[PDB]
């Protein structure tokens, strides 16, 4: 792996230290860990996110390294994205997983992440908590009590993020 | 029997920018956040739970590198430490 490995004593110290307040890890022999990357680089109106490939190669290899099988889906639409998510909610493998990772990479605006057909005038927005809603205990009972880590690279508007101060 | 479960719990979301603001991407190198996130995961996945690794990525953004962003962690409902356990 290219991730720095926990020697067995290290892990042991961590379970022996906090055992009641830690997510349980399923056995390496048998767990079926899934992760999902959705990445939009080619868009219909707005300019192509050159550089995204590196991000996909980076994250695919990491999650995999961390123990996950990785679906990568690219250049989708809020709706395609939704449908993928609902399918992801339904994968049997979750039953034998102990966590999941979803990664979204796209342009985004303040309402949420952009699907490929986004224009200024017709929005293709995936709402920040459509994503939550789709993996909650109702919609994804399989991941009840398991960590769901959602990671999002997207802009959140146009502002540069800084204010000036002096001295 | 049927028991009640919380409808949401055990979630965490990690965004590249704070609301209203841009985040930075480079042609030949990809996006600053994703790269930094990988670096930190590689180094810290062993010894730190996922929430402290995320914090350390925010701290890597504390001096505005010219281009500024500050990743934000959101909707946390993680009730327990999540240690990834690399090599296990």
């Amino acid at each position: 792996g290219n991730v720095k490995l926990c020697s067995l004593e290290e892990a042991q110290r961590i379970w022996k230290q906090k055992s009641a307040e830690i997510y349980p890890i399923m056995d390496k022999s048998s767990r079926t860990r899934l992760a999902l990357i959705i990445c939009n680089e080619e868009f219909d109106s707005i300019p192509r996110r050159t550089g995204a490939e590196v991000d996909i190669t980076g994250m695919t290899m990491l999650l995999q390294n961390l123990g996950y099988s990785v679906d990568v889906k690219k250049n989708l639409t809020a709706s395609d994205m939704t449908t993928e998510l609902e399918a992801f909610a339904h994968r049997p493998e979750h039953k034998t997983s102990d966590s999941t990772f979803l990664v979204f990479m796209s342009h985004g605006i303040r309402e949420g992440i952009c699907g490929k057909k986004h224009s200024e005038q017709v929005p293709d927005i995936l709402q920040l908590n459509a994503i939550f809603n789709m993996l909650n205990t109702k919609n994804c009972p399989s991941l009840k009590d398991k960590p769901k880590v959602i990671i999002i690279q997207a802009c959140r508007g146009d502002s540069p993020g800084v204010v000036w101060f002096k001295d | 029997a049927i028991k009640k479960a919380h409808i949401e719990k055990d979630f965490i979301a990690f965004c590249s920018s704070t609301p209203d603001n841009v985040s930075w991407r480079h042609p030949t190198m990809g996006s600053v956040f994703i790269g930094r996130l990988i670096e930190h995961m590689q180094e810290y996945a062993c010894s730190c739970d996922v929430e402290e690794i995320f914090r350390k990525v925010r701290f890597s953004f504390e001096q505005p590198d010219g281009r500024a962003q500050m990743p934000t962690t959101e909707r946390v409902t993680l009730t327990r430490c999540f240690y990834l356990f690399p090599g296990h």
């Binding site: 996110r49 050159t50 550089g51 342009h107 985004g108 690279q153 997207a154 802009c155 | 590249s16 841009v22 985040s23 930075w24 991407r25 480079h26 042609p27 996006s31 281009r67």
Partner: peptide
């Protein structure tokens, strides 16, 4: 650098 481009914003995203």
């Amino acid at each position: 650098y481009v914003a995203d």
